[PDB]
Amino acid sequence: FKFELSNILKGARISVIYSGGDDLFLIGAWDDVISKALVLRKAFTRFSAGKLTFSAGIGMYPVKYPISKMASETGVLEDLAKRGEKNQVALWNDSKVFGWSQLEEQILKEKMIPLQEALTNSQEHGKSFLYKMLELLRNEDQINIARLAYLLARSSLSEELTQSIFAWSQNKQQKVELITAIEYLVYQIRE
RNA sequence: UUCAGCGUUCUUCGGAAUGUCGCGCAUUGGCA
C-alpha cells in the first residue's frame, strides 16, 4: 500500500488521496483509474499469492464536481461491491457490479476490443450505430432483441462479431457487459 | 355457312433510413 503502490500507478494520471489496506482513495483520469485498479487487483493477488481479495468502487465525475460528493458517492459504490461478491468491483453505477476478471476480460477484452477494432475499420459505421445498439440493449424489450438482429444484418459488421453481439444480447450477463463495453468505448471514442 | 369471344397475368424486384452531435457553461469543486 505505501511503497509498491507508487510503482504500480507509475505513469498514470492518478493522485492518491490516502492509502492503506483499511481504506484506499485515489482521484485520477477515468480510463487510467480503471486500468490501474485492475493492475492493482492482479498485483495484490500475486503479492498475497491469493487468499487476499480487494473490493473497490469506481465512479466517473466532472472535474468541477465537488470532492466531498465524489468521496461520498464512490464510498457507496465500494459498499455495494463489499456487501456481497466482495472480490467483485462496482463501476460507475449501482447497476454495474462486476468481478475483476469479468471487468478486465469478459468486458474490456472479449467485447470492448472487438467493437473498438470493428468501428475503426468500418467507414460505414460510427458512434451513432453504437448508440442505436445501446438503445435496443437498454430498453430490454424482447422485440429489441429482434430489432438488434435487423440492425446487425443491415450493419454488415463481421459475421463472428454479428453473431457474438447477438449471443451477448440474449444472455443477461453478457448484455450488461456488452452495454458497459459499448459505454466505455463511447467514453473513450468521444472527444 | 353462321354465331360468339374465350382463357391467363392484376403489380413485380430492390432499397426500409444513414451520417453528425449524445449536453455545454456559471456557481460548486480544483489550483492558489
HSE value, Cβ hemisphere, 13 Å, CA-based, for A113: 8
The residues of the protein lying within 7 Å (CB) of strand B read A 62-67, 124-129, 131-132, 150-151, 154, 190
Report whether A111 contacts A168 (CB < 8 A). Answer: yes
Nearest to A174 by CA among A122, A111, A123, A115: A111
The residue count for chain A: 191
- C1’ B25 / CA A174, Å: 38
Please give the helix or strand (H or E) that residue A27 lies within, else none.
Answer: strand A25-28
The CA distance from A33 to A13, in Å, is: 8
A18 phi-psi bin (left φ>0, alpha ψ -120 to 50, beta other): beta
Look at residue A18 and give its three-state secondary structure.
strand
DSSP structure string for A53-122: ----EE----TTS-HHHHHHHHHHHHHHHHHSSTTSEEESSSS-EE-HHIIIIIITTTTHHHHHHHHHH-
- C1’ B16 / CA A155, Å: 13
Question: Which value in Å is the resolution of this experimental model?
Answer: 2.7
- C1’ B14 / CA A154, Å: 14
Return all residues near A116 (Cβ < 8 A) that are at least 6 apart.
A185, A188
Q: Which nucleotide is nearest to A123 (CA to C1')?
A: B19
Look at residue A176 and give its three-state secondary structure.
helix
The CA distance from A71 to A134, in Å, is: 29
Chain B bases closer than 7 angstroms to a protein Cβ: 16-22, 24-30
Report whether A45 contacts A52 (CB < 8 A). Answer: yes
- C1’ B9 / CA A155, Å: 38
- C1’ B16 / CA A94, Å: 38
Q: Which nucleotide is nearest to A119 (CA to C1')?
A: B19
